[PDB]
Short mmCIF file of N, CA and C in Angstrom, two decimals:
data_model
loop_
_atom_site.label_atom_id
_atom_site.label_comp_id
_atom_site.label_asym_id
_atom_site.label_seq_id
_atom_site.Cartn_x
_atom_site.Cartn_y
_atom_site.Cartn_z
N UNK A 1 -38.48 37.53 60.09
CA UNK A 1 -39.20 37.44 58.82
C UNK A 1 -40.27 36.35 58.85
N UNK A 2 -41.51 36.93 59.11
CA UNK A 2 -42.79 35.64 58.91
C UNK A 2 -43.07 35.47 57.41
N UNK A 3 -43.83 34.51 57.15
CA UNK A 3 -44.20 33.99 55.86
C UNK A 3 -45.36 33.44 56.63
N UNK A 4 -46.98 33.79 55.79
CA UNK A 4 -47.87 32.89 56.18
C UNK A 4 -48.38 31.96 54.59
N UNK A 5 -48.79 30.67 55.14
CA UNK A 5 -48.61 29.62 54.11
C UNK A 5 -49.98 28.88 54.96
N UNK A 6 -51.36 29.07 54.26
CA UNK A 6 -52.35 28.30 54.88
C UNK A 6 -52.62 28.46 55.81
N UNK A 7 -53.40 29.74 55.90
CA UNK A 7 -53.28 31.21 57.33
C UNK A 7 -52.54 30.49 58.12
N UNK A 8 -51.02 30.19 58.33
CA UNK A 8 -50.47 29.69 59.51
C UNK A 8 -48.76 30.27 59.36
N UNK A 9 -48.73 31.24 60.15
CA UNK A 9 -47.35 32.11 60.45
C UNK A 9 -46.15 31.42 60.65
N UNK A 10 -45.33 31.04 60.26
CA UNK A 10 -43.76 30.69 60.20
C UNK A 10 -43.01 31.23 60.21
N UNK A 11 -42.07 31.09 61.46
CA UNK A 11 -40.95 32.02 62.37
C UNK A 11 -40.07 30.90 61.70
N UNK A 12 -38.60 31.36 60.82
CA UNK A 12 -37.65 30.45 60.74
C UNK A 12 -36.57 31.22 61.56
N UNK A 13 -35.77 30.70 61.97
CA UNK A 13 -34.36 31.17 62.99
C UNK A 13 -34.86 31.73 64.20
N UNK A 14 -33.68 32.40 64.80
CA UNK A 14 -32.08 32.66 64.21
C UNK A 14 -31.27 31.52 64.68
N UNK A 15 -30.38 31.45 63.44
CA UNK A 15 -29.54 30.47 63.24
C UNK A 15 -28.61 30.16 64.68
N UNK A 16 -28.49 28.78 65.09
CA UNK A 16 -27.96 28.61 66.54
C UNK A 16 -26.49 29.03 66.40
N UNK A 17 -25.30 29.00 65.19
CA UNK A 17 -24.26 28.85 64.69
C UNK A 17 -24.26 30.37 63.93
N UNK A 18 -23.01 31.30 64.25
CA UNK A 18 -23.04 32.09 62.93
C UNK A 18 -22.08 31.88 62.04
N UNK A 19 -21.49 30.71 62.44
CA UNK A 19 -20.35 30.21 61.29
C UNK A 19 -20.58 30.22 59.64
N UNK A 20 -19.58 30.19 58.90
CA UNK A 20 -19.47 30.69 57.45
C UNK A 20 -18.30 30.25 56.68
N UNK A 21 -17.81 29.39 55.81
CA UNK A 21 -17.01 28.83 55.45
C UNK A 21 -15.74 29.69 54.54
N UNK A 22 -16.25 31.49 54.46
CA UNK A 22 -16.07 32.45 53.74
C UNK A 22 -14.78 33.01 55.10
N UNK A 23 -13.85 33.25 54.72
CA UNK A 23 -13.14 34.39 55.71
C UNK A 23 -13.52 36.31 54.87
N UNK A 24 -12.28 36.68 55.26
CA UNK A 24 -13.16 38.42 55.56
C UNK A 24 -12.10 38.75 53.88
N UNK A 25 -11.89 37.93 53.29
CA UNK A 25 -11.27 38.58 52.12
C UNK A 25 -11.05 36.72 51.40
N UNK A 26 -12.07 37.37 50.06
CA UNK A 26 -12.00 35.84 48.87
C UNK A 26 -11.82 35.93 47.43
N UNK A 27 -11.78 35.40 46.56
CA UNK A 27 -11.23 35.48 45.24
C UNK A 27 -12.52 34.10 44.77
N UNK A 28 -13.14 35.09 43.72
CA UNK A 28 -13.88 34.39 42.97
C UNK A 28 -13.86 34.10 41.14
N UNK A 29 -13.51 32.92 40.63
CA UNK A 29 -13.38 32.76 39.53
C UNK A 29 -14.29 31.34 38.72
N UNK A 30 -15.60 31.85 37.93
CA UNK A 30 -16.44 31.06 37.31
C UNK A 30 -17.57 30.83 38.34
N UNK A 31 -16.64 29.33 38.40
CA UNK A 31 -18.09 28.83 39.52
C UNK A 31 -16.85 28.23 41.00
N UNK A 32 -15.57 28.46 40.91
CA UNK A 32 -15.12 28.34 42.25
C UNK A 32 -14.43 29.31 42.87
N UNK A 33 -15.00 29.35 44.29
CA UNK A 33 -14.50 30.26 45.27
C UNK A 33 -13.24 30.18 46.59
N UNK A 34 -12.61 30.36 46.32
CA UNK A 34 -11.15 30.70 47.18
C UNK A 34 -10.86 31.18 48.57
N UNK A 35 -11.00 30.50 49.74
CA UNK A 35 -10.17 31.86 50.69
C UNK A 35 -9.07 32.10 50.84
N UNK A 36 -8.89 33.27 49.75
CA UNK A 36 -7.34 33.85 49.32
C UNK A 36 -6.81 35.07 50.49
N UNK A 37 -5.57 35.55 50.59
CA UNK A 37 -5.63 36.63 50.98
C UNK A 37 -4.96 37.34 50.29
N UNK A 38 -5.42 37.51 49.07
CA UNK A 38 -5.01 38.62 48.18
C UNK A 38 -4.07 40.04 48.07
N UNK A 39 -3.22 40.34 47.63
CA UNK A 39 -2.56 41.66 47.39
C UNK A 39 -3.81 42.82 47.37
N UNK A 40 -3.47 44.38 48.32
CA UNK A 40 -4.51 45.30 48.28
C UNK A 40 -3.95 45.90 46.80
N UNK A 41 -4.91 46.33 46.40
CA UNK A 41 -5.23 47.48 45.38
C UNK A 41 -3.88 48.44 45.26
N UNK A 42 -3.41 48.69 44.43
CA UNK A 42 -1.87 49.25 43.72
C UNK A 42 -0.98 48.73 44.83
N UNK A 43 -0.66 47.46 45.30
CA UNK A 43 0.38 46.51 45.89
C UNK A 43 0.78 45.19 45.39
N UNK A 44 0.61 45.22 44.03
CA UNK A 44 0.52 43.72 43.81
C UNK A 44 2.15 43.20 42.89
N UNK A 45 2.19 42.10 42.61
CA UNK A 45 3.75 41.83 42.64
C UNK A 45 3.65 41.16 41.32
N UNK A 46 5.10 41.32 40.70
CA UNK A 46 5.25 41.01 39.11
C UNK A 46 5.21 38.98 39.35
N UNK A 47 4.64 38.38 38.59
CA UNK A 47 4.30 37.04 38.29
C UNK A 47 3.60 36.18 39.41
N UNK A 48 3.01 36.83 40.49
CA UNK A 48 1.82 37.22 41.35
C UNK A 48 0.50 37.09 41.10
N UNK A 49 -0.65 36.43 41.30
CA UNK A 49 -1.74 37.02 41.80
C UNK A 49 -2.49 38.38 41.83
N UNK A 50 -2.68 39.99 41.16
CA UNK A 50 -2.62 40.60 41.06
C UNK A 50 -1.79 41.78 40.73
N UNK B 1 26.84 15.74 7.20
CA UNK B 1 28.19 15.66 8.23
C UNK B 1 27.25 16.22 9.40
N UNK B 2 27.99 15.23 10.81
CA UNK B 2 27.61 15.66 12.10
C UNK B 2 29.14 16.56 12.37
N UNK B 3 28.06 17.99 12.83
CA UNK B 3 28.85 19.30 13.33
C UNK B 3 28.63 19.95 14.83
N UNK B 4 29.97 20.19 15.25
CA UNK B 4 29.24 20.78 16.94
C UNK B 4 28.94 22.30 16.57
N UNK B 5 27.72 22.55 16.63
CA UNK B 5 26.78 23.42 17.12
C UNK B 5 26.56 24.13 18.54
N UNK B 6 25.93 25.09 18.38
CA UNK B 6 24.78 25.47 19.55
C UNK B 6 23.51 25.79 19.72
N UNK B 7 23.33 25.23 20.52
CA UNK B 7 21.94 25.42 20.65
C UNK B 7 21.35 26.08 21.97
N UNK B 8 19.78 26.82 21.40
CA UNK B 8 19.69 27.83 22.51
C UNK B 8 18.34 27.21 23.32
N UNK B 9 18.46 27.91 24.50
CA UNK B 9 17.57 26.76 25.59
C UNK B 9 16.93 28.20 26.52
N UNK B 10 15.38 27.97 26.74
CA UNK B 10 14.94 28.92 27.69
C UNK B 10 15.56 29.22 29.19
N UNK B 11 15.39 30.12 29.51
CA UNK B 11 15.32 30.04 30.89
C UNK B 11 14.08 30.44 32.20
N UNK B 12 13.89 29.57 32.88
CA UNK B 12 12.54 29.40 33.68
C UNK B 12 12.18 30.92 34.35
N UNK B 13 11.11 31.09 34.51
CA UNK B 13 10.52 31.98 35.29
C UNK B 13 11.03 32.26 36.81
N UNK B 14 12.32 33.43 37.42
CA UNK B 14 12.36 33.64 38.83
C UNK B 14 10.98 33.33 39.50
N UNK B 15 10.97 32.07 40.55
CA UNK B 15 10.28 31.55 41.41
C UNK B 15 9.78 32.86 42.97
N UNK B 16 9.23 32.94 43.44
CA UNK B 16 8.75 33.96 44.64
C UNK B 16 9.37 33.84 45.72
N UNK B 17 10.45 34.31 46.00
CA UNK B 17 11.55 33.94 47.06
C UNK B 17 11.27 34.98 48.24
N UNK B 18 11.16 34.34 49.36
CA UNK B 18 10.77 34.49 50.60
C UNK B 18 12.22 34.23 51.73
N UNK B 19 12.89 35.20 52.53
CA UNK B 19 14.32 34.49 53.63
C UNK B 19 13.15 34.54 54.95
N UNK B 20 14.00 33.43 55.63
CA UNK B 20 13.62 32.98 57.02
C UNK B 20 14.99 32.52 57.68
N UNK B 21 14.73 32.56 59.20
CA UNK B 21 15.90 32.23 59.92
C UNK B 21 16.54 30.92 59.59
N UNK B 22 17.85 31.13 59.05
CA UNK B 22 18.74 30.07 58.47
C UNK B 22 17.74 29.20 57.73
N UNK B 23 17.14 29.51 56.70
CA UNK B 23 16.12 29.34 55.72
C UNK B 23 15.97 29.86 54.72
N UNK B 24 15.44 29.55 53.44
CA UNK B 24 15.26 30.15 52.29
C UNK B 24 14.03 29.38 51.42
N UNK B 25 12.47 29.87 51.31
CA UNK B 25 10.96 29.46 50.82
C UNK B 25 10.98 29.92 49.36
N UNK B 26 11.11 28.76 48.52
CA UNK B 26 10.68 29.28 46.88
C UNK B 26 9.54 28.56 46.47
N UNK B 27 8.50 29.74 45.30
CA UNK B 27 7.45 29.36 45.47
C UNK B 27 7.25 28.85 43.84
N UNK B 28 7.97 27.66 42.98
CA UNK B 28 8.14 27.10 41.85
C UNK B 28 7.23 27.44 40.98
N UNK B 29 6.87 27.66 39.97
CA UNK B 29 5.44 27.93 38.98
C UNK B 29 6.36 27.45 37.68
N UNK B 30 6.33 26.17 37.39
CA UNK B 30 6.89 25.94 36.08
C UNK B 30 5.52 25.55 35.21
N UNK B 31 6.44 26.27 33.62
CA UNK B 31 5.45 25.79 32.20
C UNK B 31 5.61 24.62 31.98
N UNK B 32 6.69 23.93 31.92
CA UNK B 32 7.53 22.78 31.81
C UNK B 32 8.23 22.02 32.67
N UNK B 33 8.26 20.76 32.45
CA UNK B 33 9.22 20.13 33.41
C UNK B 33 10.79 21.03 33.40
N UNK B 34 11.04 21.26 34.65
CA UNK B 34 12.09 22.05 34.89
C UNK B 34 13.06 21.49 36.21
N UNK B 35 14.04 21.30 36.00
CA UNK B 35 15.17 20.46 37.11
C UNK B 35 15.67 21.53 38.20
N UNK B 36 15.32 21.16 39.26
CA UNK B 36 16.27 21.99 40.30
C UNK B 36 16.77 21.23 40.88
N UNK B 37 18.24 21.31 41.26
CA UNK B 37 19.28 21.17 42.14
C UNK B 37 20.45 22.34 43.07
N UNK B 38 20.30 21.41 44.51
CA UNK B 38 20.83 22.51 45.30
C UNK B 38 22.25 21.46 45.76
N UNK B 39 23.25 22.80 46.37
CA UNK B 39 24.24 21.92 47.59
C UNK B 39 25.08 23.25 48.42
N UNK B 40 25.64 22.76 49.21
CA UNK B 40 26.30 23.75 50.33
C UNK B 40 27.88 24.05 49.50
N UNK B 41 28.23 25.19 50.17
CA UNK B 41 29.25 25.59 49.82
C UNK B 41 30.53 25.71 50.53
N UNK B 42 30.29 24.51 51.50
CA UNK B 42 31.25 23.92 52.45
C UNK B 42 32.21 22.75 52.03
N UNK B 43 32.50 22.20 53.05
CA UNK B 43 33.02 20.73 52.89
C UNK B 43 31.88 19.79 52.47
N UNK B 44 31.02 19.36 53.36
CA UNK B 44 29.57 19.04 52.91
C UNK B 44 29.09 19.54 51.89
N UNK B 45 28.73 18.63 50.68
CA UNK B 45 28.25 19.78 49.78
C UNK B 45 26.55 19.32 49.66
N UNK B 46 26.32 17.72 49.47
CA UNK B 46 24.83 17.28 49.88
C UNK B 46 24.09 17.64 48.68
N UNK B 47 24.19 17.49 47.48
CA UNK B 47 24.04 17.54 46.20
C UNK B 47 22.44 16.62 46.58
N UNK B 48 20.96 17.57 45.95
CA UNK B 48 20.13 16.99 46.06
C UNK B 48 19.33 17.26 44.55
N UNK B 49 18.61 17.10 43.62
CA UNK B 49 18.42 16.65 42.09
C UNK B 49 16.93 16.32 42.35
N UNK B 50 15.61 17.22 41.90
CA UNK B 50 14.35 16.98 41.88
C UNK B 50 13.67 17.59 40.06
N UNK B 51 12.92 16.83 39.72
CA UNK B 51 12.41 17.30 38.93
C UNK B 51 11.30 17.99 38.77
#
């Protein structure tokens, strides 16, 4: 993705790291985010999390 | 006049119980301060009292 800014082309990346502080399943509520690993969809347990 | 009565008292929410080898994981969620105490059912009995 270039961007020119004062006819002059800017290459940003690719990132040296593809690290991510997110795993592959999260739970989001307001403004904070969780790495939960949540109950799937019609599996969830009485006084539980879903 | 002071009379003996009864009186009625909640009981806590079953905790999320998990078995493991010669083990047993509970996962507590109290509304209230709530007392647990455990002990063996041996000679040893090891009576332990947390709030």
């Amino acid at each position: 993705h270039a961007v020119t800014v004062k006819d002059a082309k800017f290459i940003v990346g690719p990132m040296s790291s593809a690290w991510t502080p997110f795993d592959n399943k999260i739970v989001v509520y307001k403004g904070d985010v969780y790495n939960m690993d949540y109950p799937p969809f019609g599996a969830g347990r009485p006084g539980q999390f879903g | 006049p002071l009379a003996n009565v009864t009186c009625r008292v909640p009981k806590a929410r079953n905790p999320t119980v998990t078995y493991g080898k010669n083990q047993v994981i509970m996962l507590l969620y109290p509304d209230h301060p709530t007392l647990l105490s455990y002990r063996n059912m041996g000679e040893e009995p090891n009576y332990q009292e947390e709030w």
